[PDB]
Coordinates of C-alpha atoms and ligand atoms in Angstrom, one line a residue:
X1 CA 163.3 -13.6 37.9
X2 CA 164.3 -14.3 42.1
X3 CA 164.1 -10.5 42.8
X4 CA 162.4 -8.7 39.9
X5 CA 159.1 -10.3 39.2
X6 CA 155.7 -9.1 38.1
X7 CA 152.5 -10.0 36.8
X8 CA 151.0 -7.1 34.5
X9 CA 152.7 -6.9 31.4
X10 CA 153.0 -10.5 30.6
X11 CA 149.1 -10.1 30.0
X12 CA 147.9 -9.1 26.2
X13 CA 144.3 -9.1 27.1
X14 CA 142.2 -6.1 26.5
X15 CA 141.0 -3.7 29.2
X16 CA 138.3 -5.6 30.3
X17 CA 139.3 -9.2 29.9
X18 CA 143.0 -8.4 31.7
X19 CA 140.3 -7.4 34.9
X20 CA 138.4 -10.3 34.7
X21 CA 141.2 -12.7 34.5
X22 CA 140.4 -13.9 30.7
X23 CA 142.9 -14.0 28.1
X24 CA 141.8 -13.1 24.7
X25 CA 143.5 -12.8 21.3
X26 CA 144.0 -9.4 21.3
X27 CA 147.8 -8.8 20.9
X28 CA 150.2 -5.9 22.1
X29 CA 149.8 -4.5 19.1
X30 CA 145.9 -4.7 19.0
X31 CA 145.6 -1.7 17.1
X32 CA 147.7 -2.5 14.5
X33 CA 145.5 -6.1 14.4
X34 CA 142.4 -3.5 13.7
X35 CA 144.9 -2.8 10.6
X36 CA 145.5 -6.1 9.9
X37 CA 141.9 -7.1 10.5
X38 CA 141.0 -7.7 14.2
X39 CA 138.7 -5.7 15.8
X40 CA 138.4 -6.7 19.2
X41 CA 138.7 -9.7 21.3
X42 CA 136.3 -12.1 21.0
X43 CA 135.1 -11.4 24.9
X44 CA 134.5 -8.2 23.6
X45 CA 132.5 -9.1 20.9
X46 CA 131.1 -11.6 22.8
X47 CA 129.3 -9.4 25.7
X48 CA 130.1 -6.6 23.4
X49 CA 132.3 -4.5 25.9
X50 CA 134.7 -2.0 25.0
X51 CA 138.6 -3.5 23.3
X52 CA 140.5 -0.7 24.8
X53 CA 144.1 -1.0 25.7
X54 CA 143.7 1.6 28.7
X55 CA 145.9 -0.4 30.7
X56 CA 148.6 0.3 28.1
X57 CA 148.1 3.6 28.4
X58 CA 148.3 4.1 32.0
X59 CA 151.5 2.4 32.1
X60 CA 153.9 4.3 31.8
X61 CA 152.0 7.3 32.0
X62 CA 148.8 7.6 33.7
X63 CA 147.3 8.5 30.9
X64 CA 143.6 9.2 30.9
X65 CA 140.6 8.0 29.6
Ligands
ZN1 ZN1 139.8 -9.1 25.8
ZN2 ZN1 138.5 -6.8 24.1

């Protein structure tokens, strides 16, 4: 809070909206919202990018794409 503070994980936004600064529904558990019925983020859809949660996955290992 006074001496620890970050802005990274706080956002849920997919790959490409997290970037652009645009929130979108897409959770943390986005993949599990494919499950539930989500897709991807209505940016996404919208411009028809790419809901990827890349960011995630170079987190706490830079994991690659
Ligand atoms: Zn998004
Ligand atoms: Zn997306």
């Amino acid at each position: 809070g006074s001496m620890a503070d970050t802005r990274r994980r706080q956002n849920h936004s997919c790959d490409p909206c997290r970037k652009g600064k645009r929130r979108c529904d897409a959770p943390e558990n986005r993949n599990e919202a494919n499950e539930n019925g989500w897709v991807s983020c209505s940016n996404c859809k919208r411009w028809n990018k790419d809901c990827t949660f890349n960011w995630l996955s170079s987190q706490r290992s830079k994991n690659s794409s």
